[PDB]
Design a protein around this nucleic acid. Structure first.
Ligand code: MG
Length: 141
DNA sequence: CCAGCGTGCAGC
DNA sequence: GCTGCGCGCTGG
């Protein structure tokens, strides 16, 4: 399952191979523009390349990175706990994890697994991708 | 100038 | 169901 690239360039399209990273991206984009968030995301993944590492992080360090994005303390603590549960808790869908809601979940079920037909998103960008996909899937296979 | 917004979410 | 978290960007 390789979700296709779209004319809307959701960052999920390039991060689907690694659900932890895709899901971290969703968190980064919580009421934050991609213009601001996505450059910080690469710095974050540089310092914390995986959930194995991130769940050991000092949340104050993470907060320093998030400072320009707003929601810096909330999200930094969420990121460390989310990463912890991602690896340690039994889950089937990541909505079961702290810090992931419907939008993150929908992103997961569209990009990381082949369940896009079953998803009913309520997020504007995601709907654009998801609607577009219903219209072009036969054409793309 | 500065109010509205940004690919939300958990807690209550 | 509502609210707090929160910065920089935007555009009249
Ligand atoms: Mg959750």
């Amino acid at each position: 399952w390789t979700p296709p690239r779209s004319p809307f360039n959701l960052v999920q399209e390039t991060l689907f191979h690694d659900p932890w990273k895709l899901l971290i991206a969703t968190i980064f984009l919580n009421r934050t523009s991609g213009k601001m968030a996505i450059p910080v995301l690469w710095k974050f993944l540089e310092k914390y390349p995986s959930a194995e590492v991130a769940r050991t992080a000092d949340w104050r360090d993470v907060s320093e990175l998030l400072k320009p994005l707003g929601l810096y303390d909330l999200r930094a603590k969420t990121i460390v706990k989310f990463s912890d549960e991602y690896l340690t808790k039994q889950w089937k869908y990541p909505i079961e994890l702290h810090g992931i809601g419907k939008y993150g979940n929908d992103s997961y079920r569209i990009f990381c697994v082949n369940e896009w037909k079953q998803v009913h998103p309520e997020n504007h960008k995601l709907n654009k991708y998801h609607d577009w996909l219903w219209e072009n899937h036969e054409k793309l296979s």
